Structures are given as structure tokens and as C-alpha cells.
Amino acid sequence: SYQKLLKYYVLNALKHRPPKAQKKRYLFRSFKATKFFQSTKLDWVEVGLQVCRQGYNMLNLLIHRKNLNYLHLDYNFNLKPVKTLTTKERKKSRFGNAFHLCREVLRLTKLVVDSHVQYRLGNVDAFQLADGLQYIFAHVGQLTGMYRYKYKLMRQIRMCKDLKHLIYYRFNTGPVGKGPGCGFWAAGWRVWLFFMRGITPLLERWLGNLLARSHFDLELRAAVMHDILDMMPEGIKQNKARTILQHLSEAWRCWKANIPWKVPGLPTPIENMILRYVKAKADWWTNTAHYNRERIRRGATVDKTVCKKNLGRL
Amino acid sequence: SYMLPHLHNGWQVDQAILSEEDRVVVIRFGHDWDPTCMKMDEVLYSIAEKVKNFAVIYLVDITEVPDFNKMYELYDPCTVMFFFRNKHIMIDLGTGNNNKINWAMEDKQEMVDIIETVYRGARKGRGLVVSPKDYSTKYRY
């Protein structure tokens, strides 16, 4: 744990770049300048409860807007189905990693605020409150299913556990032994706030979007066909498109065979376009043949068609 | 390009399936821009005239014709659908679902064999036919 904490400290100190010049725009000052926001003074527990309620309501609105009445979200932000999902319903229920990540963030906030309201009610002692906060910030992965939706988050989790190994084995010296009584939650709270800093813009962008209002030859052939058929008389293009496509195929075959290709009745602008197309496709063909041969000779996994084609090209 | 005929509404599709009596109707549900659909349509054009005697190919855009999305579970970026005398033919490719190809094979001979087997099983009377190959493994080594 010490070694990995040092590793992450060194990584932070080495990947560090000096901050870039800004214009100093403050979000909350802008919010206060509008009519939709108003200021007051409130207890932290009250705003914690209010934020939990607002998060639950907003998640309910997002769920109900998709008409996914078969999924129920409890007050602990644990989303569960109520019936066997149809394939159409199962596809409709694919909310993505962003929604689940936001839901688990709101669940962690619910956990912290619920511990604080539990202390405020008087059921548990302040020492119990601090120890519970330490446990919450050291066991986010166990208490909350965060790692699946965002894999990088797992790293943060290990940090917290490492920090526990840093604190406990210093806290539990002398008369104090192993026990559930150690409350020191600065490190994990710091780590999860720093994770929240990084993931805030992602969830904001997702919510804004949700609440708004290889094959070079084929593409080359399609693009040259579109360009030619745009510069084409409307009344004549019924079969001339097929004729010029046959001409393109014949030109490609003729280049592949080292045989002269000179259509006498073909006008010179169309002929020059076909020559350019054949040149581009031949360059791509040669390059991809060489690349595939290098891949096969190196030992990459390939199927029969690729090898057969490569052999032909080569 | 896409010289294969396209169907622009559900009406075109549902009389195209009933238009052919001695030929297998092939419908590609997807989008031209979709690369996978591009590979399959190139393969189909490579064999469009080879199977003219006993098969026909039509291209249907999902955005243009979205009525078959729910009934045919058209949730993949691309599907290939086989009909004969108004009856769908399921093909046992070994991929788990027998209703649609759902993938783009580069070899045109594989598609030729698949459509030939579908025709043989449809004319004989079996609604479900077995692919003469296993596509569970990509056979890459």
C-alpha cells in the first residue's frame, strides 16, 4: 500500500502540467445573476437531504421519460426491474454507463447524508459518525457498485484501501488493537472529491445531451460514381451509369493484368477521371497487400479469405 | 452506387416478399453508409446476377422503412432476411439466433451456398434450414 501510494504520488508529480491561462468565469456567480436561482443560508444536513431528494426526483424523471415503468428506483438509488424484460424492453433499458455512474454517485451522496442525519437524530455517537464516514469512504466499491460502469474508478478505490492501510496500522498501535473504532476520513473524502471533480463535466454533458430541445476501395468507387453521375444529363443516366461502372471494373481488371486499356469512344474527361480512380485504387491495393503480407508473416491471426486474397494480390 | 433495387416503404417490402414465388427474397435491413452493410452489399452485387435464376435481393433502409424494427427485432446495425412464398426461412448458422445473418462475410461463395441451401430447404418444405458451415468460430489462425 505504501509503495502504490508512492507510485500514484510520483505519477501525479510527473504527469503534472502547469495550469493554462483562463478568463476567470465563475459558474455560481453566473447562476446567481439569473432569475432562476436565489440565495439563502441553510444547514448542511438540510441541503444534503434536499440534494438527495432532488437527485431521486431527477432520476425518476429520466426513467419515466423513456416510459420504462418496469424499472423501479428506490430511495437508496438501487435500480431493479419488476418483471422479466422483453428484448425490446431490454434494449430500451440500456441507459449507458453515464446514467449508472450518476446514479451511484447519488447513492454515495445518499449514504453520506444518511449517516449525517443518523448522527443528527442522536441514534449514534459522533465517534460512530466519523467511523462510519471513514468506512463509507474506504469501502465505496463494496457499498456502491461504481467500478463496473467506470473501470478507471477502480484505481481510486485501491487508493482508498491503501490509505486505510496507511492509517489503520498507525492508528492501531499501542493500547489500541484491531477494531471498528477508527475514524479518520480525510484521505478517502479527498480522493472521492477529486474523482468527482474529474467526472462532473462528463455527467453534465450527458445530461445536457439527454435533456436537449480497410474498405477504401468501396468508398473511392462510390465517391467517383457520385461525382460522375452528378455531372450527368438527367435523361441519359438510366443505363450510362451501369455502362460506366462496367468500364470502371474493366479498367481495374486491365490494370491488374498489365494489359493496355484504351476505350475509343470514351470521352477524355471521363477517361481521365477513370485513370485517376484506377491510380488511387492501385496505390491503396498495393499498400494494403504489403501491409497484409507483413501482418501474416509476422504471425497475426488471419482467416482463409485474407490469405487467399493476399496471395492473389502478391 | 448500390445498383441493387431499394424499397422505400413497407408497402414495397410487403409486396416484394409476395412478388416472388419460385425465388428466394433477400432483404438487407440497414444503412448504406454503415460499412458492414457496404461489405454485404458489395458481396451481394458480386453475386446479384449469379443467383438471378432462384433468388432476388432488395435493400431496405431502416430510417426510411422503420416499421419492421419491432417485429423483426431489427436492433443490429445490419440484418439479412430470407423469405419464400410469404414464409420466413430461419438459417442455423450456429451464432445463437437463426433468423438473421447479422454479419458481413467477405467470401461471396459462403453467401451463395447459404442462399442455395435456403432455396433447397424452402422448395422442399422445411421452414428451418441448416447452414452448410459453422460461423460460431471465425476460422482465423
Partner: peptide, 13 residues
């Protein structure tokens, strides 16, 4: 016919 699909492809790509 072919041009109708070419315009759709170009617009979508």
C-alpha cells in the same frame, strides 16, 4: 435510381 442512393450516401457521409 443509382443517383438517388448516391445522394443519400454522400449526405450521410
Amino acid at each position: 435510381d443509382i443517383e438517388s442512393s448516391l445522394k443519400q450516401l454522400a449526405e450521410r457521409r
